[PDB]
Amino acid sequence: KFPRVKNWEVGSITYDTLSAQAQQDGPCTPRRCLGSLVFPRAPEQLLSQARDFINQYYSSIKRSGSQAHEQRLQEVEAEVAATGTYQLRESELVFGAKQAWRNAPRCVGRIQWGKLQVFDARDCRSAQEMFTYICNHIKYATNRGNLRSAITVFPQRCPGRGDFRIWNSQLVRYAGYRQQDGSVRGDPANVEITELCIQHGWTPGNGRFDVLPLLLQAPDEPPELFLLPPELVLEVPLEHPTLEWFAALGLRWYALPAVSNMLLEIGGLEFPAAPFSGWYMSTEIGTRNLCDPHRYNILEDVAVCMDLDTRTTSSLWKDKAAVEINVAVLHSYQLAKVTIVDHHAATASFMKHLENEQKARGGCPADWAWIVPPISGSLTPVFHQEMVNYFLSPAFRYQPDPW
Amino acid sequence: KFPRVKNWEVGSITYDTLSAQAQQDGPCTPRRCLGSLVFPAPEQLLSQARDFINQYYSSIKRSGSQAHEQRLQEVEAEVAATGTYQLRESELVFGAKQAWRNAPRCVGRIQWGKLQVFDARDCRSAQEMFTYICNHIKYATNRGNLRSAITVFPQRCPGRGDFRIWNSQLVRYAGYRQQDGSVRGDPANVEITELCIQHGWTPGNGRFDVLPLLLQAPDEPPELFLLPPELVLEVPLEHPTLEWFAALGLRWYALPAVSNMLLEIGGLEFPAAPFSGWYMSTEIGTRNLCDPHRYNILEDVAVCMDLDTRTTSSLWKDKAAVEINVAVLHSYQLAKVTIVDHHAATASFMKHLENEQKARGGCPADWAWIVPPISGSLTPVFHQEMVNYFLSPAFRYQPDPW
Ligand code: HEM
Ligand code: HEM
Ligand SMILES: Cc1cc(N)nc2cc(-c3ccc(CN)cc3O)c(F)cc12
Ligand SMILES: Cc1cc(N)nc2cc(-c3ccc(CN)cc3O)c(F)cc12
Ligand SMILES: C[C@H](O)[C@H](O)[C@H]1CNc2nc(N)[nH]c(=O)c2N1
Ligand SMILES: C[C@H](O)[C@H](O)[C@H]1CNc2nc(N)[nH]c(=O)c2N1
Ligand SMILES: [Ca+2]
Ligand SMILES: [Ca+2]
Ligand SMILES: [Cl-]
Ligand SMILES: [Cl-]
Ligand SMILES: [Gd]
Ligand SMILES: [Gd]
Ligand SMILES: [Zn+2]
């Protein structure tokens, strides 16, 4: 049998038949569940993955079992036998990147998974050309505030040659300077990469919102430093619709969330450099990036300016300040005409995705703990939706830091 | 093989060695995680009974002793004579506390050592059931200074029926279905409201009509008992600065007293064992009053707050919820009824995790239920990795008696 899955707001019940096809294994066993852990973790095996991928492709275009389907299978079979690897067709790479997004269990934004611009950078041959490809990505995806989802795919891993890597975890990151107390000026999430940036010749700053340079790695080659042109990096100054002093906090965030440190895996090929980007959900900025105690940690500062009683928890000063910070983020992005989505609309759209995917594939891999937003969880519909978490391929995967 | 568990705020690391002693199997496999699902022989009885007796004696440091061997031989002879056995009253107290301490979805477990255990195993008939319950409610409420308590009715045994409390809680508001199709009252209790009506009770017409009690002696049909209104402490809800909030007519009850779960100790099963604590404010203010399938008052409150409800990005839902939770905390404190806010409760759970790490090498915890339903990441438990597994003694869900 297949896991029965229930929505408790509405009473509806589905069965996730797709989960039976989970190839790779997660961290849970019948004896104990580890679903809350942040990081859970041969021509023959390559071929069954490639085969399965090719089968997925030909199903998506409703030409399963066709002459072209059998010929492509045979072609991949013969190329793996001759060379130990194979090359994707362009249309397969596009389909593969969209499937990896569609399969990501921790992404609430997957209603968009079919609108993804895929830049083929598989002919890239240097760190310098890499930088050109990334700048075109940022330009296209920013679109002067009307943000567009995109992925740029650099050459696949292959034996006898080092990987392309982007060392930065995102294309746009703020510097995090280790003050000597152990404190930090700027973003503490970025202390390691900031120091590697300086270790490699970047002249630092001392502001809180200093955009980091990119550390780009060509095969068998130390990383090279590249400064982003300031007009390529769209930023939003934060202000609050009614709390005028808020603007004096001097807060900013960048428009484009572009993750650059994950591995794209398609039919057994691995792409260690394939940055992808969408647009922000406001709670990522307002609640996590600004209010996490180990990020910018502004919550007490705002609550005091709001004149709340911060000496007892029962006044809910924390909740009130966080709500207003999230209001500032939404108001500020809308005022700047930069795409943003709030957690209520985002989770509503995700519920539509679950319904589409149940029809299309008989299920959807989803990580409840990551889909429910970090404030107001039970106020969104995903809170009341049971979910099944499992790993399908194509996939985006975490990978070791290249240093 | 022992799971590594990290706190990402502090960066600290522990290993949960207790998860190795997981007696039952949960719903997850290497292929798929089902952690977010709400509802996941004499030789068999003996091995469970022996495991619990071994547990108890190791916990009182006098194990492998004469009293330890004496007790093991007694339970073996009991089950051979009768098919079951009797818990010594101290074993029953220890087993009830362990079942609380082992409950993965309870954020209030810092209090697990402080539990009043009322032994009602000498109970027969539903009228005595009702008197035990009323003594529980009276003791647990304590004029607003709430005290944790459990009352244990006779265990299931072969051939004989069971004591059951058909109500999911001792205090529940009626849910009346309408011609409109809507429910007046609590939608959660539509089923038990119509059971109470069928078994005699003449219904009210209010949004907060306290239900009667449907208590079932073994084999006999259930009997309808009214609760003395002076026993059922309630809190009218007002807000410290929104003067109109009082006029919404909202209220809630003091005692969270769950009466439909089954207590399992040493292979023994107590299908009636109501237990109560005190409320975390988010259970009332967020879940009970704001869930779309409960009272669903969010938009009513936002309209009175003159919020812009035609767009989500105003966060009118978030603002109304926070103020509804303020009103709960204010109303309970002003009424001198015990209540804990979600910040205080998650801070204490973090302490409980640290105590349990030293006490026995870990703690089963259900992250999705420990993290509060508003302001999740503002609480320290959001950043704490957790391991969920089943230990015995335990509280378990059980099928409806009907
Ligand atoms: C278009 C709008 C999008 C929105 C609103 C969105 C939203 C989100 C959010 C809120 C998260 C959780 C992040 C966190 O908690 O730090 C997430 C994770 C993720 N997103 Fe999306 N996303 C979007 C587009 C995309 C695109 C275009 C891709 C790839 C093509 C993608 C792939 C992923 C993946 C793989 C994760 C999980 C990574 C991990 O395991 O940590 N998303 N997304
Ligand atoms: C003393 C103050 C207590 C507080 C603040 C507290 C808090 C909570 C909360 C917030 C939940 C989640 C329930 C929900 O979301 O509906 C819960 C569940 C639970 N509590 Fe506690 N609790 C307390 C006392 C107790 C006591 C005395 C017992 C038993 C003797 C107990 C056993 C349980 C169990 C078994 C569950 C989970 C039931 C299930 O699996 O659904 N708690 N508690
Ligand atoms: C594509 C996309 C859009 C968005 N709006 N947000 C994202 C957030 C993440 C993320 C960041 C940091 C971490 C590390 N905690 C985990 C993530 O999933 C991501 F990869 C992709 C995102
Ligand atoms: C003992 C105790 C204290 C408290 N403050 N709250 C509780 C809440 C519950 C609960 C209610 C309803 C449901 C059904 N959704 C699940 C529960 O865990 C419980 F059993 C015991 C509680
Ligand atoms: C420990 C816990 O699982 C961890 O902090 C997770 C929980 N859920 C999350 N959900 C999202 N979307 N993003 C996160 O970073 C996290 N963190
Ligand atoms: C499907 C999901 O597990 C379900 O809605 C859970 C989530 N977390 C919860 N957490 C608590 N404390 N109480 C609940 O009822 C729930 N519901
Ligand atoms: Ca070729
Ligand atoms: Ca009609
Ligand atoms: Cl981010
Ligand atoms: Cl409740
Ligand atoms: Gd103002
Ligand atoms: Gd008015
Ligand atoms: Zn699991």
Q: Minimal Cα–Cα distance from B278 to chain A, Å?
A: 16
**Same domain (yes/no): A296, A318:** yes
Nearest ligand, CA A75? 7
Resolution expressed in Å: 2.0
Residues 6+ apart with CB under 8 A from A82: none
Indicate which technique resolved this structure: X-ray
**Same domain (yes/no): B339, B289:** yes
Residue carrying the six token digits 């509405």: A10
**Same domain (yes/no): B195, B74:** no
Q: Minimal Cα–Cα distance from B204 to chain A, Å?
A: 26
To 5 degrees, how large is the angle CA B205–CA B208–CA B210?
95
- Check A110, A173, A197, A324 and give the catalytic one: A110
| Distance separating alpha carbons of residues A15 and A13, to the nearest angstrom | 7
> Distance between alpha carbon B166 and the CA centroid of its chain, in Å?
15
Pick the atom of ligand 1 nearest to A104's CA: 35
For residue A188, is it within any domain?
Answer: yes
| Distance separating alpha carbons of residues A377 and B373, to the nearest angstrom | 5
Per the annotation, where are the binding residues of A? 28, 33, 36, 107, 170, 279-280, 284, 288-289, 369-370, 383, 398
* Helices of type H across B335-393: 342-360, 367-370
Residues 6+ apart with CB under 8 A from A96: A53, A57, A88, A264, A266, A267, A394
Residues 6+ apart with CB under 8 A from B15: B2, B3, B4, B5, B361, B362
For residue B217, is it within any domain?
Answer: yes
Chain A residue at shortest CA distance from B32: A390
The residue whose CA has the least distance to atom 16 of ligand 6 is B369
Rounded to 10 degrees, what is the CA torsion of A29, A30, A32, A35?
60
**Same domain (yes/no): A267, A339:** no
| Distance separating alpha carbons of residues A295 and A156, to the nearest angstrom | 34
User: Does A291 contact B376 at a Cβ distance shorter than 8 Å?
Assistant: no
Nearest residue to A301 (alpha-carbon basis) of A293, A209, B22, A347: A293
Q: Binding site annotation covers B28?
A: yes
> Distance between alpha carbon A360 and the CA centroid of its chain, in Å?
23
Q: Does B98 touch chain A (CB under 8 A)?
A: no
Identity at B172, one-letter amino acid code: R
For residue A97, is it within any domain?
Answer: yes
Nearest ligand, CA B27? 13
How do strand B275-276 and strand B149-152 relate by DSSP bridges? antiparallel
| Distance separating alpha carbons of residues B226 and B207, to the nearest angstrom | 18
- The answer to whether residues A167 and A216 touch, using CB atoms and an 8 Å cutoff, is yes
Ligand 3 pocket mutation, candidates A39, A107, A108, A254, criterion most atoms within 8 A of CB: A107
**Same domain (yes/no): A243, A366:** no
| Distance separating alpha carbons of residues B234 and B254, to the nearest angstrom | 6
- The answer to whether residues A357 and A3 touch, using CB atoms and an 8 Å cutoff, is no
Pick the atom of ligand 6 nearest to A384's CA: 5
User: Does A32 contact B388 at a Cβ distance shorter than 8 Å?
Assistant: yes
| Distance separating alpha carbons of residues B223 and A39, to the nearest angstrom | 53
**Same domain (yes/no): B166, B270:** no
How do strand A224-226 and strand B262-265 relate by DSSP bridges? unpaired
Residues 6+ apart with CB under 8 A from A224: A127, A128, A215, A216, A217, A218
Q: CB contacts < 8 Å between A and B, how many?
A: 204
Nearest ligand, CA A242? 11
Half-sphere exposure at residue A202, Cβ-oriented, CA atoms within 13 angstroms: 24
**Same domain (yes/no): B152, B267:** yes
Which CATH number do you get for residue A26? 3.90.340.10
Residues 6+ apart with CB under 8 A from B78: B84, B85, B86
To 5 degrees, how large is the angle CA A279–CA A366–CA A120?
50
* Count of the separate structural domains present in chain B: 3
The residue whose CA has the least distance to atom 12 of ligand 3 is A259
What is the residue-wise DSSP string for A363-396? Answer: --B--HHHHS-SSSGGGSGGGGB--BB---SSEE
**Same domain (yes/no): B72, B196:** no
How do strand B149-152 and strand B116-119 relate by DSSP bridges? parallel
| Distance separating alpha carbons of residues B166 and A367, to the nearest angstrom | 35
Containing structural domain, residue A273: 16-122+149-159+263-277+347-371
Nearest residue to B328 (alpha-carbon basis) of B206, B207, B235: B235
Q: Does A241 touch chain B (CB under 8 A)?
A: no
| Distance separating alpha carbons of residues A386 and A371, to the nearest angstrom | 11
| Distance separating alpha carbons of residues B153 and B158, to the nearest angstrom | 16
Q: Minimal Cα–Cα distance from A34 to chain B, Å?
A: 5
Q: Does A182 touch chain B (CB under 8 A)?
A: no
**Same domain (yes/no): A288, A323:** yes
Residue carrying the six token digits 């105690």: A293
Which CATH number do you get for residue A141? 3.90.440.10
User: Helix or strand or coil: residue A310?
Assistant: coil
Residue carrying the six token digits 């700047």: A336
Q: Which residues of A touch B313 (CB under 8 A)?
A: 282, 330, 334, 342, 345
Contacts of residues A85-88 at CB distance under 8 Å and 24 or more positions apart, as own/partner, are: A85/A46, A85/A156, A85/A158, A85/A159, A85/A269, A86/A50, A86/A269, A88/A266, A88/A267, A88/A269
User: Does A327 contact B317 at a Cβ distance shorter than 8 Å?
Assistant: no
Q: How far is CA A320 from CA A306, A342, B74, B315, in A?
A: 9, 17, 59, 11
For residue B185, is it within any domain?
Answer: yes
Selected residues 29-58 of chain A with any CB under 8 Å from a CB in chain B:
29-38
Residues 6+ apart with CB under 8 A from A357: A18, A102, A363, A364
For residue A390, is it within any domain?
Answer: no
**Same domain (yes/no): A312, A222:** no
Q: Which tokens hold the place of B32? A: 């798929």
Which CATH number do you get for residue A316? 3.90.1230.10
**Same domain (yes/no): B202, B285:** no
* 3-class secondary structure per residue, A103-164: HCCCCCCHHHCCCCEEEECCCCCCHHHHHHHHHHHHHHHHHHHCCCCEEEECCCCCCCCCCC
Q: Does A316 touch chain B (CB under 8 A)?
A: yes
For residue B382, is it within any domain?
Answer: no
- The answer to whether residues B393 and B100 touch, using CB atoms and an 8 Å cutoff, is no
The verdict on the CB of residue B258 being under 6 Å from ligand 4 is: yes
| Distance separating alpha carbons of residues A97 and B128, to the nearest angstrom | 67
User: Helix or strand or coil: residue B123?
Assistant: coil
Rg over alpha carbons for chain A, rounded to the nearest Å, is 23
**Same domain (yes/no): B41, B110:** yes
Q: Does B343 touch chain A (CB under 8 A)?
A: yes
Chain B residue at shortest CA distance from A312: B344
User: Helix or strand or coil: residue A241?
Assistant: coil
Rounded to a whole number, what is the distance in angstroms from the first to the last CA of chain B? 43
Residue carrying the six token digits 């294309």: A171
Nearest residue to A168 (alpha-carbon basis) of A189, A146, A147: A189
Half-sphere exposure at residue A36, Cβ-oriented, CA atoms within 13 angstroms: 25
For residue A384, is it within any domain?
Answer: no
For residue B10, is it within any domain?
Answer: no
Rounded to a whole number, what is the distance in angstroms from the first to the last CA of chain A? 45
As separate numbers, helices (DSSP H) first and strands (DSSP E) second, chain A gives 11, 18
Cis peptide before B104 (omega within 30 of 0): no
